[PDB]
Design a protein that fits this description.
Metallo-beta-lactamase, Chain A; 5-stranded mixed beta sheet; 6 helices; binds zinc ion; hydrolase; cephalosporins; antibiotic recognition; monomeric; metallo-B-lactamase
Length: 226
Amino acid sequence: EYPTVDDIPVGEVRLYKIGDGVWSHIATQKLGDTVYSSNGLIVRDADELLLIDTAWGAKNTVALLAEIEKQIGLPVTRSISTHFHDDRVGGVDVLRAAGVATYTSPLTRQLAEAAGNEVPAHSLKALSSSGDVVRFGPVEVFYPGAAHSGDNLVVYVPAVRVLFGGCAVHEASRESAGNVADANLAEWPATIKRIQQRYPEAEVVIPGHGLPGGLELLQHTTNVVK
Ligand SMILES: [Zn+2]
């Protein structure tokens, strides 16, 4: 039942309920001969929605907003991108066109600018140091340190113990680190331990790509990395 590249019809976006007021969103991009999927999060707050990550590009992000309006019918008012790559900020301008207030850390804004990627309009302050946390509506945003990228953030929904790990966390089936061109492989183990120590009660851990699991994906990630 978790959506995969084998069942999301081409160009569509799917939502998947994780817990009370929490969905993941799943989108695809074909690169060469391989279709990839990518996850983000949607979190209800009162009568609005907080979006975590774009659906990887403008076309997909249009489809994401349509799917949200069809299935949930509440307005996305704010977003947070969890690092500077296209599966996180690609489609920010779509969000901005729709009236969404787009956020991310100052460093992610800088790296996104440097990469020629789309740039969220607003900075989350108080995230510049490893171990910094901030509250944001119904979530916590945590900067655990460098890993998949120098700026990677994780998002926790404390009411229902759902941790969205983004690409700092690998799915269970993944056994190679993947794209390390922006990664800090030396730091990535410490970064994972910081996540483990901060969110010991998490019930679900959602990787940036692939199937949800539990806290076991964190050590799995360290194992893949080292
Ligand atoms: Zn990335």
